[model samples]
Target: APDIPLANVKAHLTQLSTIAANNGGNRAHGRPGYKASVDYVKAKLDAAGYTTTLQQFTSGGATGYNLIANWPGGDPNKVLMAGAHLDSVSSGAGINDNGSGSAAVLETALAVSRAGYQPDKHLRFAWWGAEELGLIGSKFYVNNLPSADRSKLAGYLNFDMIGSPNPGYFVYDDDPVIEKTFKNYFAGLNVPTEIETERSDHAPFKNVGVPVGGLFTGAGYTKSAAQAQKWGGTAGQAFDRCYHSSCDSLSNINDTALDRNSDAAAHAIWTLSS
Candidate 1:
């Protein structure tokens, strides 16, 4: 896995912030900010030579979309996927709640191109819309995909809240192989990670018995004293006090958390696909 640049990931967060400010100050689904966020991400993948698709749907009398990008040249039957929700709550830019994961996944996809990597399994990356609204976009995709297509999926990795201000490194304890892969990487850096069973997009895949796993810093969950000793953040405080508040703007991110998770994303992507 290429060492993903933190600057590049933060650059996308900045853009998302600007987009939210320009469009009613939130990237909530069916809003201008949400689609604008989608367009910005799609353009980057398109420019990087990815074959992209926009899956459209309607929610609450408003149309929504999910962006899926496929990298050319891999075993189409054994697909490896990574995704992050692109929509935020109605109050804020949703930078740390999601822009963190969205940007990291986008950069990892871009890294595959920059490194000219051609992994043995098929690779697909997604930016889901309306995830803040009960995982609508991801469920729509999973429900609509044919059984054969679902079977084609070798694994699904979800990234959410990876840059919380008072972050705690958490790895999904799903599939044995996938879970171990993430645990091993973090162990090498002496980063202690706790188990994250389900709370994000991985649930959609997990429900169907598809292998699933991913990484997270945390959400509104309070960190323990031991966690602070290992991760060096304030204990007893919510990992992201801003959470869904309007305060979840550009200033809500922890650079160390963002940088480590971004690199971890690239690591898991390249490793699993290999």
Candidate 2:
């Protein structure tokens, strides 16, 4: 996998921040900001030669959409999927809560296109809608998928909250291979990781027996003194001090966490798909 440029990922986050500012203070489900976010991602994928689909559903009396992008030329029967929630809470811009994960996924997909990678398994990337709403979008997606198609899924990798200001490196403990894949990336950087505690879109996929794995920076949970010793952040502070708050703006991110996680995302995608 090519090195995923930190600037490229941050640029996407900036765009998401501007989208939130333009439409509303937040990109909650059914809001204009949410749809604009979907449109922005879709346009980028379309330009990169991926076949894009806007899977629409109704949630909380408003329309929600999931943007699915598939790269051409791979075994359709076996798909390696990666995704992140694109929706934010109604309180703030949600750059770190999710835009961090979303942008990394977007940039990784773009990297796939730029390299013209044709892996053995099909690659599908998604930006889920209404994930903050109790994982509604991902659950709907898994529930709606036919068993045959679900069986076709080789694996599902999820990314959420990967750029917390005071970050902790957490890899989901689901699926041994997927877990090891992410750990290997972190290990290569000599970064220590713990099993993830928070649940996100991966929960829905895991419930259905799909092999799932992903990366996360900490959230509202307080970091321990030992954790601080390992990860080098304030022990008492939450991984993301601005989680779900109006303060989760562009500045709520740790550039080092974002850059490392973004590269690890590309590493996993390229490795698993191969």
Candidate 3:
């Protein structure tokens, strides 16, 4: 797997920030900023030669959309999927809350296009809508997917918040293969990881028995003295002090954590799909 460029991921976040700024102050579900976010991602995927689909749903009496992109020419029976929730809380631009995950996943997909490398399993990428509203978009997708199509999914990888001002590397303890893949990547960097305790978009897939796993940087959780010693951040401080707040801007990101997690995402996607 190629190392995903941090600059590329950051650029995506920058665009999302500007989108939120232009539309509303946030990218919450049913908001204009959320739709703009979807459009931005969809355009990039289309330009990269992906067959992109815009899935529409209604929640909170407002229309919502999910963006799905398919990379052509792989086995149809076996599929490897990756996704991130693109909507932010109403409080802020949601850069760290989810723009981090959204950007990383988008850049990894672009990397696949750049490499032009074929994998045995078909690759599909998604940017879910209304995730901040209790995983509404992902649940709608899982519930509505044809049973046969659901069976074809080999695994699902989700990324929610992978960059925090003070981050702690957390890996989802779901599928053994997926979990080990992420751990191996972090191990290579001598980074110690804790089992993820929070839930995100991966929950819907895991609920339906799809093997699921993903990475997360802590959010709203206070760092312990031990974690601080290992990760080198201020102890007792919330991993993301700006989490879901108006202050979660570009400056709220930890570049090192974002870069490492983005590379890990690319590594896992290439390894699992191949």
Candidate 4:
């Protein structure tokens, strides 16, 4: 695999946060920041030799776009899809909420391309818009796909928030099979994790019975004193000190959290794709 530098990931996070702030405190779709973020990812993918597709769907009177890029391999019948939401919450920059996940996916795609991994299944990466509004982008993509096309998907890997100040890593336990897979990964690394499958873009895929799994760092909820003791953070501190407020700036990101999750994501991708 091509080496992915931590610096590149950090730079993308900073750049995207700036875009979100300039576009009215958030990057949710129907805003200028949304378009800028889409263009930025599209350009990066195009430069990396992936033909990009913009899947446009209308929701709430605004057009939501899901940027998709496919890395073809031995069998199109089997595909591993990985994604992150590009839209921020209406209140903040959403850097950790999703930009962390998005950049990790982007870096994985670029590294895989450079490494030239040819597997028995296809690999795909996506940046979903309007996810903050309720997984709209990913839902639209899955809902609109033909039954045959949807069946080709073997599993879905999602990354949402991977950089929380009081980060306690989690994997969505939407499906028993996927839950076991995620748990096994963390167990191998001796990293304890939590399982919360209540929400996120992966929900859409799960609704259709497609196995889905993902990693999350932290968000609005704070860790309890007991929980904090295990994680080595302040008890009662929000996983992200700046969950969805103006404080959710680029500076709020935990570099250690980002790096750990990025590596976790990369390993998951390679394992699934191979």
Q: Per the 3 Å backbone cut-off, how many clashing residue pairs does candidate 3 have?
A: 0
Ranking by lDDT: 2, 3, 1, 4
lDDT of 4 by residue, 1-274 (tens): 3445778889889889888867888887888888899999999889888879999988899988999998765588988899999988778788887889999899888888788788677888999989978889998999898999999999999999887777887778776766677677678767787776327888889889788888888787878776676667777778887876777778888887788778777777777776
Error in Å for residue 249 of model 1: 0.7
CA-RMSD of model 3: 0.7
The TM-scores of all predictions, comma-separated, are: 0.98, 0.99, 0.99, 0.94
lDDT of 4 at 68: 97
Q: Give residue 204's error in model 3 in angstroms.
A: 1.2
Clash count of each predicted structure? 0, 0, 0, 0
Clashing pairs in 2: none
Each candidate's lDDT (Cα)?
A: 0.93, 0.94, 0.94, 0.83
Question: What's every prediction's RMSD, in angstroms?
Answer: 0.9, 0.7, 0.7, 1.7
As a TM-score, model 3 comes out at 0.99
What would the per-residue lDDT of candidate 1 be over residues 32-116, giving only the tens digit for each residue? 9999999999999999999999999998999999999999989999999999999999999999989999999999999999999
Off by over 4 Å in 1: none
Winner by TM-score between candidate 4 and candidate 2: 2
Query: Over 4 Å off in model 3, which ranges?
Result: none
Residue 122, model 1: Cα distance from true site in angstroms: 0.7
